[PDB]
């Protein structure tokens, strides 16, 4: 048996590594990831070509996140979750919700595409994280990054870096926008429905003010390593 998790995961590390890992995921050549300045600043998406197909937020679990109110949400609904079991998937578990959120920029053949199938296939429903055929996906593809090839930096010091941040993605369906929250062992949680001047999704000050929630709730230390990040079209 070879070695495993015994590596470090992407931090501070938005454009580069990002590209890398999703492409081999199955990510066609006519999307990709790209970092982000701003998003209350209505100059930054004045200086956007094509609108983003989704975004993400890099933000760590401060001690306090009073925020947060845990019940038992809706397991039926019109979108997918998993759980984070495995703790070194903090790169992979990041971006398998960015693309599996989003299954209609997905290449017939890829590793997400035959994901999706394998667990209609199974016990499973078709995201639920609850068989072994679920966990193959995961434990193959990590492996490809715990070997020398180093994902995230280098001489993997950590199995993190010096805090530990966390990875929320999500975009808009039938009128509303939510959340993927993997921390959650009950499941996704809603924002609201989505606002009438949302220019693509930047915009959209629901998700803006529940950023703006978590930093009050956290330390100067803690919002420190705070950036953004997006799956667009890409630019090339």
């Given at each position: 048996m070879s070695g495993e998790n015994r590596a470090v995961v992407p931090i501070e590390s938005n454009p580069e590594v990002f590209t890398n890992?999703?492409?081999?995921?199955?990510?066609?050549?006519?999307?990709?990831?790209f970092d982000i300045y701003s998003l209350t600043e209505p100059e930054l998406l004045a200086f956007?070509?094509?609108?983003?197909?989704?975004?993400?937020?890099?933000?760590?679990?401060?001690?306090?996140?009073?925020?947060?109110?845990?019940?038992?949400?809706?397991?039926?609904?019109?979108?997918?979750?998993?759980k984070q079991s495995v703790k070194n998937?903090?790169?992979?578990?990041?971006?398998?919700?960015?693309?599996?959120?989003?299954?209609?920029?997905?290449?017939?053949?890829?590793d997400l595409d035959n994901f999706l199938?394998?667990?209609?296939?199974?016990?499973?429903?078709?995201?639920?994280?609850?068989?072994?055929?679920?966990?193959?996906?995961?434990?193959?593809?990590?492996?490809?990054?715990?070997?020398?090839?180093?994902?995230?930096?280098?001489?993997?010091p950590e199995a993190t870096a010096d805090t530990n941040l966390h990875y929320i993605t999500y975009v808009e369906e039938n009128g509303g926008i939510f959340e993927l929250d993997g921390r959650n062992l009950s499941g996704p949680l809603y924002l609201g429905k989505s606002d009438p001047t949302a220019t693509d999704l930047i915009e959209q000050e629901l998700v803006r003010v529940r950023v703006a929630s978590y930093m009050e709730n956290a330390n100067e230390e803690d919002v420190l390593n705070f950036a953004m990040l997006g799956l667009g079209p890409n630019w090339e």
């Amino acid at each position: 048996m070879s070695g495993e998790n015994r590596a470090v995961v992407p931090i501070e590390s938005n454009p580069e590594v990002f590209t890398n890992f999703a492409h081999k995921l199955g990510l066609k050549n006519e999307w990709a990831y790209f970092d982000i300045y701003s998003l209350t600043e209505p100059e930054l998406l004045a200086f956007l070509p094509r609108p983003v197909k989704a975004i993400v937020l890099l933000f760590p679990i401060n001690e306090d996140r009073k925020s947060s109110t845990s019940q038992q949400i809706t397991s039926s609904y019109d979108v997918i979750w998993f759980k984070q079991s495995v703790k070194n998937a903090c790169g992979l578990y990041a971006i398998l919700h960015s693309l599996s959120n989003n299954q209609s920029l997905l290449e017939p053949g890829s590793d997400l595409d035959n994901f999706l199938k394998s667990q209609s296939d199974t016990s499973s429903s078709k995201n639920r994280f609850d068989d072994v055929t679920t966990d193959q996906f995961v434990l193959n593809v990590i492996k490809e990054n715990v070997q020398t090839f180093s994902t995230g930096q280098s001489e993997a010091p950590e199995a993190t870096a010096d805090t530990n941040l966390h990875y929320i993605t999500y975009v808009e369906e039938n009128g509303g926008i939510f959340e993927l929250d993997g921390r959650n062992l009950s499941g996704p949680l809603y924002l609201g429905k989505s606002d009438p001047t949302a220019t693509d999704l930047i915009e959209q000050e629901l998700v803006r003010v529940r950023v703006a929630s978590y930093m009050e709730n956290a330390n100067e230390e803690d919002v420190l390593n705070f950036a953004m990040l997006g799956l667009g079209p890409n630019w090339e």
